[PDB]
Design an enzyme around this catalytic site. Structure first.
Site, PDB file in Angstrom:
ATOM      1  N   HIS A  68      13.081 -19.277 -56.673  1.00 56.37           N
ATOM      2  CA  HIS A  68      12.505 -19.715 -57.969  1.00 56.37           C
ATOM      3  C   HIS A  68      11.180 -19.010 -58.218  1.00 56.37           C
ATOM      4  CE1 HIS A  68      15.405 -23.144 -57.868  1.00 56.37           C
ATOM      5  NE2 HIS A  68      15.437 -22.822 -59.165  1.00 56.37           N
ATOM      6  N   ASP A 107      10.807 -21.462 -65.423  1.00 57.03           N
ATOM      7  CA  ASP A 107      10.569 -22.037 -64.067  1.00 57.03           C
ATOM      8  C   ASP A 107       9.096 -21.861 -63.662  1.00 57.03           C
ATOM      9  OD1 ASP A 107      12.865 -23.353 -63.037  1.00 57.03           O
ATOM     10  OD2 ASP A 107      13.844 -21.447 -62.540  1.00 57.03           O
TER      11      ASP A 107
HETATM   12  C1  JM0 Z   1      19.348 -23.317 -57.685  1.00 55.32           C
HETATM   13  C2  JM0 Z   1      20.458 -24.263 -58.091  1.00 55.32           C
HETATM   14  C3  JM0 Z   1      21.375 -23.749 -59.186  1.00 55.32           C
HETATM   15  C4  JM0 Z   1      22.082 -22.490 -58.794  1.00 55.32           C
HETATM   16  N1  JM0 Z   1      21.796 -21.285 -59.368  1.00 55.32           N
HETATM   17  C5  JM0 Z   1      22.626 -20.325 -58.782  1.00 55.32           C
HETATM   18  C6  JM0 Z   1      22.666 -18.885 -59.157  1.00 55.32           C
HETATM   19  C7  JM0 Z   1      23.384 -20.936 -57.781  1.00 55.32           C
HETATM   20  C8  JM0 Z   1      24.327 -20.436 -56.774  1.00 55.32           C
HETATM   21  N2  JM0 Z   1      24.616 -19.075 -56.807  1.00 55.32           N
HETATM   22  S1  JM0 Z   1      25.014 -18.070 -55.608  1.00 55.32           S
HETATM   23  C9  JM0 Z   1      24.069 -16.702 -56.012  1.00 55.32           C
HETATM   24  O1  JM0 Z   1      26.375 -17.790 -55.715  1.00 55.32           O
HETATM   25  O2  JM0 Z   1      24.575 -18.619 -54.370  1.00 55.32           O
HETATM   26  N3  JM0 Z   1      24.890 -21.208 -55.858  1.00 55.32           N
HETATM   27  C10 JM0 Z   1      24.612 -22.564 -55.894  1.00 55.32           C
HETATM   28  C11 JM0 Z   1      25.286 -23.407 -54.991  1.00 55.32           C
HETATM   29  C12 JM0 Z   1      25.040 -24.766 -55.137  1.00 55.32           C
HETATM   30  C13 JM0 Z   1      24.146 -25.216 -56.159  1.00 55.32           C
HETATM   31  O3  JM0 Z   1      23.895 -26.589 -56.264  1.00 55.32           O
HETATM   32  C14 JM0 Z   1      22.897 -27.073 -57.181  1.00 55.32           C
HETATM   33  N4  JM0 Z   1      23.503 -24.411 -57.008  1.00 55.32           N
HETATM   34  C15 JM0 Z   1      23.730 -23.132 -56.884  1.00 55.32           C
HETATM   35  N5  JM0 Z   1      23.068 -22.313 -57.809  1.00 55.32           N
HETATM   36 MG    MG Z   2      14.491 -24.718 -63.187  1.00 54.02          MG
HETATM   37 ZN    ZN Z   3      15.765 -21.079 -63.213  1.00 48.88          ZN
END
Ligand code: JM0
Ligand code: MG
Ligand code: ZN
Length: 313
Positions: A68, A107
């Site tokens: 983030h 963010d």
């Molecule tokens: C930061 C939470 C939101 C979020 N943004 C992304 C891009 C992802 C992501 N992508 S990845 C690159 O394939 O690992 N995997 C996630 C797996 C679980 C999850 O639970 C909330 N959020 C994910 N997530």
């Molecule tokens: Mg956010």
């Molecule tokens: Zn974001």
């Protein structure tokens, strides 16, 4: 006003593509953002001295967290630039201006922790903002930086336009709360399928811009497999830190966030792709057909995560 940014040829070309990666050279990211503003909005949208000084204050107020961070901010802005360029007649002058700034700021001052952790910790921000805690803070930090001397990139707007653009940014940043995504996409799905969806209805535009913000915010799931796979290490690094802090409060974290259960990552990913990412880009493609490459790339990556679970890699 005759000062354009240009990029090297490979970037100039690849930046138009949804799956573009902004690279590991931090010092090129402000230039990449200005490039995108000048092509998406116009070279007159913002006074370059004010934009440059706004961008570097925003950068400064992103923290050095694994995911983030400033690179996420600019990545999410690029996805919005790609959606806006592929749909250029659907959005107003004000919306183009507002939405790239909203993505860059969405963010601001993130600490790597979820709204749930702030709440269980009893963080002061949780008493100030009972719902969408971090997201109301991100909007607040945005307004703070706009009111720094020399930072008001919207100073040339009329009173009405200024108030409209800040209202676009506020709803856009609030919509990045994933808790609000589920209901927003359900409503849009219903509206699209019964034919009632109307982009001249401001409350419908708001919902659609909300879905675009979710699509940009999750766009790491729409990159080429090697980018997506490596970004998953940064996302999971925050999850495990939050799991650690949960345990310090005397609370067993869900398994996704427990670093002692790293074998249950690939299945935590699958749930997220099927419950959140795939439906998000599906509904978006239905409303904005040119955004189909995001849905296709998201599906390609779901398929790559399924392989990881079988032990095929
Ligand atoms: C930061 C939470 C939101 C979020 N943004 C992304 C891009 C992802 C992501 N992508 S990845 C690159 O394939 O690992 N995997 C996630 C797996 C679980 C999850 O639970 C909330 N959020 C994910 N997530
Ligand atoms: Mg956010
Ligand atoms: Zn974001």
């Amino acid at each position: 006003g005759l000062m354009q940014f240009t990029l090297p040829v490979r970037l100039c070309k690849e930046i138009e593509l949804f799956h573009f990666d902004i690279g590991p050279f931090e010092n090129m990211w402000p230039g990449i953002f200005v490039y995108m503003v000048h092509r998406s909005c116009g070279t007159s949208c913002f006074e370059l001295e004010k934009l440059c000084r706004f961008i570097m204050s925003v950068k400064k107020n992103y923290r050095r967290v694994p995911y983030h961070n400033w690179k996420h901010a600019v990545t999410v802005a690029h996805c919005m630039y790609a959606i806006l360029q592929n749909n250029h007649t659907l959005f107003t002058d004000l919306e183009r201006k507002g939405l790239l700034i909203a993505c860059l700021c969405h963010d601001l001052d993130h600490r790597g922790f979820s709204n749930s952790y702030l709440q269980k910790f009893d963080h002061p921000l949780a008493a100030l903002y009972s719902t969408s805690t971090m997201e109301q803070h991100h909007f607040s930090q945005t307004v703070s930086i706009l009111q720094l001397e020399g930072h008001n990139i919207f100073s040339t707007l009329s009173s009405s336009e200024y108030e409209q653009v800040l209202e676009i940014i506020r709803k856009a940043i609030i919509a990045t709360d994933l808790a609000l995504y589920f209901g927003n996409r359900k409503q849009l799905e219903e509206m699209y399928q019964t034919g009632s969806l109307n982009l001249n209805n401001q409350s419908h535009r708001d919902r659609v811009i909300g879905l675009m913000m979710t699509a940009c915010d999750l766009c790491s799931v729409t990159k080429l497999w090697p980018v997506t796979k490596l970004t998953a290490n940064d996302i999971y690094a925050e999850f495990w830190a939050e799991g650690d802090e949960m345990k310090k409060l005397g609370i067993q974290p869900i398994p996704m966030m427990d670093r002692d259960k790293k074998d249950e990552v690939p299945q935590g990913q699958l749930g997220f792709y099927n419950a959140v990412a795939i439906p998000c880009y599906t509904t978006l493609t239905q409303i904005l057909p040119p955004t189909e490459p995001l849905l296709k790339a998201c599906r390609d990556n779901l398929s790559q995560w399924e392989k990881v679970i079988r032990g095929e890699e």
